[PDB]
Amino acid sequence: PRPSGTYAGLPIADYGDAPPLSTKTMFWRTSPEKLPPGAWEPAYLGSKDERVDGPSLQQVMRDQLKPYSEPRGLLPPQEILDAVCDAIENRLENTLEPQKPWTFKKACESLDKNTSSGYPYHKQKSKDWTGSAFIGDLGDQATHANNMYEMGKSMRPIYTAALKDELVKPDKIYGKIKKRLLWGSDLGTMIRAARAFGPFCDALKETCIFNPIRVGMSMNEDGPFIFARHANFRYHMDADYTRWDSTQQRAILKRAGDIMVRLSPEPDLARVVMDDLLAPSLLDVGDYKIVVEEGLPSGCPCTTQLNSLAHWILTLCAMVEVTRVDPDIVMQESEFSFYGDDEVVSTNLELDMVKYTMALRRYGLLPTRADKEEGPLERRQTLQGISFLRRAIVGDQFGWYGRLDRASIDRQLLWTKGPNHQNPFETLPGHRPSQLMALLGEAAMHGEKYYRTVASRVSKEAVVPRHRSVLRWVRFG
Ligand SMILES: Cc1ccc(C(=O)Nc2ccc(S(=O)(=O)O)c3cccc(S(=O)(=O)O)c23)cc1NC(=O)c1cccc([N+](=O)[O-])c1
Ligand SMILES: [Mg+2]
């Protein structure tokens, strides 16, 4: 750890080991025809992107790192924070079934084998996986990490920075180029965090309908119940935060982590891992590993739950600050849904929206109105039209459900995933059945008319069910 200075506003701690940022996309066009105006396309691919002449990917990454050197917003008032945290912990103790510890074997099995091991080998995890265990280098890395876990010994996570290959609005390619920062965790940290927090994460997933952290929900199976519950409350809103992860305070995440640790079956071992996760983070940006003291270190498996929990603490602190009602009463009078930064907030309380917005902003968060104008967040008295997990919530005669917007459905027709390549507009030879049947489902939820337009598009080239049938399957079966 010898070099020094400042990289993208953040301290340099060492030289970096990360491989080069990706110059390819997994998205291919489904026909050679020209795309409509305003059509979304895969994010910028760097100096070799034929579509535009933009900055280096490393510069694009430096842009994403800016928010992490911004100053934090403020802690909620301490007396409110303490009471909110207690009420959250208490609700979780009243609902979660105690779990057994996770074994090394279980931890290994849980890892997604089709992503990278991160530092130091940067290889797809499948490559040292036998079907039942890690061998070779990953085996060594995993076993060592597991030993350290069992001994309650600290290890420093090393995260690897990347940029997300996804379809984006054209202006993010042909205007001011943007591309989203991803933190990839090192396999050692994944093994330790899996063993320590997999149990809590499982317990919490079993309650995803009765508790606000919805991670693990099935939209088609649980959405109807989840949204029917929200609708029992009068006022509905969604703060639609900007840059949620980069604006988090580690002090808040430490509060969320404390709760996770105390509700874990190996709390002394889990405490060591959570402290490592929340200590100033080492992020490999290629040239340098830099130190990031603030924001969400979003590599590991449990981080969505941790982030969700931090979301819960802040939303509730803001509501208590403004309404001056006790946390437990706010919770009696509300239904929340959280998935990382994504929220739905339903309440019977008459919130002073201007005062609510100001408190969120005082905490360093960046809530945004639907019109992106300045001023206070808005609320409505129907759940319908609020979104969660990229679906509009819709109510009808049969009940509530989540519907994918037409535009997202169109997009999945224009593009298909396949191996990585350099030119997005290239069509993939050689035809995705189950994915077609799913698309018909979503199309169906928009009526027979739109369903039929999508149904023709699907027939090419390529068992096309009737609207009424498929609707019934997706809504009820
Ligand atoms: C965030 C997100 C973004 C894109 C997709 C998604 O469906 N992507 C795609 C999958 C498969 C294909 S395929 O090539 O035809 O097989 C896609 C093809 C084109 C475009 C997409 S995409 O929507 O633009 O990514 C595809 C899914 C998600 N994930 C969710 O909607 C999601 C996340 C967590 C939980 C739930 N959920 O419980 O409903 C749903
Ligand atoms: Mg939302």
Q: What is the secondary structure of 280-311 as a DSSP string?
A: SEEEE-SSEEEEE-SS----STTHHHHHHHHH
Which of 322, 86, 311, 350 shows the shortest CA–CA distance to 214?
311
CB 152 within 8 A of CB 49: no
The coordinates were experimentally obtained by X-ray
Neighbouring C-beta atoms of residue 423, cutoff 10 Å: 15
Domains and CATH numbers, the chain: 1-21+78-213+250-298 (no CATH), 22-77 (6.10.250.3230), 214-249+299-385 (3.30.70.270), 386-477 (1.20.960.20)
Q: Is the CB of 472 under 6 A from ligand 1?
A: no
CB 415 within 8 A of CB 43: no
Q: Before 461, cis peptide (omega within 30)?
A: yes
Backbone angles phi and psi of 333, in degrees to 5: -95, 15
342 marked ligand binding residue: yes
Taking CA atoms only, the protein residue closest to ligand 1 atom 21 is: 412
Taking CA atoms only, the protein residue closest to ligand 1 atom 8 is: 412
Q: Is the CB of 436 under 6 A from ligand 1?
A: no
Backbone angles phi and psi of 99, in degrees to 5: -120, 160
Q: How far apart are the first and last CA of the chain?
A: 58
Residue 335 DSSP symbol: E
Tokens 């290239």 correspond to 426
How open is the CA angle 137-160-20, to the nearest 5 degrees? 90
Q: Is the CB of 414 under 6 A from ligand 1?
A: no
Pairing of strands 342-347, 41-42: unpaired
109 marked ligand binding residue: no
| Distance of alpha carbon 100 from alpha carbon 198, whole angstroms | 10
Pairing of strands 391-396, 387-388: antiparallel
387 marked ligand binding residue: yes
CB 427 within 8 A of CB 421: no
Specified resolution (Å):
2.3
Structure tokens at 402: 């989540």
| Distance of alpha carbon 66 from alpha carbon 80, whole angstroms | 30
